[PDB]
Write a protein that binds this ligand. Structure first.
Ligand SMILES: CCCCC/C=C\C/C=C\CCCCCCCC(=O)O[C@H](COC(=O)CCCCCCCCCCCCCCC)COP(=O)([O-])OCC[N+](C)(C)C
Length: 203
């Protein structure tokens, strides 16, 4: 992760560049919308998120976003999660709860946050990249996602909450049934965002 990337993540934050290709809404909640672009060759998706979360100190959100011990503690979909220093960087292992029959999914990745000063504005930006480790090979039963990358941009909304932009993409190593998307969309996330807000006020 370079200087470059971090600032890049801040862009669509200011301005939602969706014109480009065939993006599509999918959800709107707590003041948040989720777009997605489908690579027709692979059938994979690209998600993009914008929105505002009043009641979430831009500063809190960011801290809460890196606090595993706590995140592990309140995020109903976290099966396993822990960090380790490998060389000079922080590598994260994360296991995600998938409805049985489906195998959970686990990620090994390089995470990095940087608080930016752009125009006298604190713009909390975090980056995520999939990486690998001899000592941390794949697991049986759990699907190791080897392609994954996300970036989240936090910022004050001026009032009580925080305006945010997020880019996501990973290859789940399996087909995601559309009902799952429907649940994710129609119930999954809404609740998550709900549980997370509760998670802020209680920090
Ligand atoms: C500044 C705002 C902070 C974020 C809040 C706003 C939006 C986050 C929620 C949704 C973003 C959509 C793209 C991420 C999906 C990956 C799952 C995840 O991992 O979902 C969580 C939030 O759990 C949830 O929704 C609960 C849903 C879990 C069900 C699992 C199967 C989902 C199948 C596809 C979902 C279909 C799209 C949803 C329709 C809206 C965001 O993971 P994370 O970014 O906290 O770190 C993530 C680090 N891994 C990648 C290593 C985990």
């Amino acid at each position: 992760f370079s200087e470059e990337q971090f600032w890049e993540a801040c862009a669509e934050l200011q301005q939602p560049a969706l014109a480009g290709a065939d993006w599509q809404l999918l959800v709107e909640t707590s003041g948040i919308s989720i777009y997605r672009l489908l690579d027709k060759k692979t059938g994979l998706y690209e998600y993009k998120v914008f929105g505002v979360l009043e009641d979430c100190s831009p500063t809190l959100l960011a801290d809460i976003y890196m606090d595993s011990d706590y995140r592990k503690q309140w995020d109903q979909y976290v099966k396993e999660l822990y960090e380790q220093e490998c060389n000079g960087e922080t590598v994260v292992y994360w296991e995600v709860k998938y409805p049985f029959p489906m195998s959970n999914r686990d990620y090994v990745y390089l995470r990095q946050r940087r608080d930016l000063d752009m125009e006298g504005r604190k713009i909390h930006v975090i980056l995520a990249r999939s990486t690998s480790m001899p000592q941390l090979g794949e697991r049986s039963g759990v699907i190791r996602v080897k392609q994954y990358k996300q970036s989240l941009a936090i910022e004050s909304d001026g009032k009580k909450g925080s305006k945010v932009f997020m880019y996501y993409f990973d290859n789940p190593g399996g087909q995601i049934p559309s009902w799952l998307i429907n649940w994710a969309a129609k119930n999954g996330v809404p609740n998550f965002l709900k549980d997370m807000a509760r998670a802020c006020q209680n920090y």
